[PDB]
Amino acid sequence: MIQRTPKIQVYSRHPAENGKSNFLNCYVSGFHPSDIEVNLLKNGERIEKVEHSDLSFSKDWSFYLLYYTEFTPTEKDEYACRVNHVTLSQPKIVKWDRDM
């Protein structure tokens, strides 16, 4: 049996401009087993948009998930990715930083 902790990156498709339609991406990589929960949060609430996701696999017991939704950045809204996985003792929340 093998288990690997997901690496989590949160980033927009295009440079963020308040307040212009864009896409917010989570790339959750290198994890095992495949059981996982991934959501984008807006001010702590699951994003009120259609989710897109794409799962792939490496032969070295590794899964890769690209997850995204539409979003319109603003100054006051904070976004985050929330991941839960058996390797995590609590859900992991990774903030979006448009300057990161």
Numbering used by the authors: 0 to 99
Sentences copied from the publication:
Beta-2 microglobulin (β2m) is a 99-residue protein, physiologically acting as the light chain of the major histocompatibility complex (MHC) class I. β2m displays a classic immunoglobulin fold, and is well conserved among vertebrates. β2m tertiary structure consists of a seven-stranded beta-sandwich; according to standard nomenclature, β-strands are named from A to G, and loops are named after the neighbouring β-strands. The characterization of β2m structure and folding dynamics gained considerable resonance when the protein was found to be responsible for Dialysis Related Amyloidosis (DRA). The mutant protein is the etiological agent of a previously unknown systemic amyloidosis, whereby patients carrying the D76N mutation accumulate large mutant β2m amyloid deposits, especially in internal organs.
In the wt β2m structure, residue D38 resides in an area rich in positively charged residues, and establishes H-bonds with both R45 and R81. Upon D38N mutation, the interaction with R81 is lost, while H-bonding is maintained with R45. To compensate for the lack of the D38 negative charge, the E50 side chain moves toward the mutation site, bringing the E50 carboxylate at H-bonding distance with N38 and, in parallel, pulling along all the CC’D-loop. Contrary to the D53N, D59N and D98N mutants, the structure of the D38N mutant displays evident conformational changes relative to wt β2m and the other D-to-N variants. RMSD values calculated between D38N and both wt β2m and D76N are over 3 Å, when 97 Cα atoms are taken in account. The values drop to about 1.2 Å when the β2m AB-loop, which is found in the closed conformation in D38N, is excluded from the calculation. The β2m region surrounding the D38N mutation site undergoes significant conformational changes, leading to rearrangements in both the CC’D-loop and the C-terminal tail. Moreover, in D38N variant both D and E strands are longer due to torsion of Psi angle of S57 and the formation of a H-bond between the O atom of this residue and the N of S61. The analysis of D38N Bz-score distribution shows a pattern similar to the D76N variant: the EF-loop (hosting N76 in the pathologic mutant), is more rigid than in all other variants, while the CC’D-loop (as in D76N) and the C-terminal tail show higher flexibility. Although this mutant is the most destabilised (ΔTm of—3.4°C), the Tm drop is much lower than in the case of the D76N variant (ΔTm of—10.4°C) and, importantly, D38N does not display increased aggregation propensity.
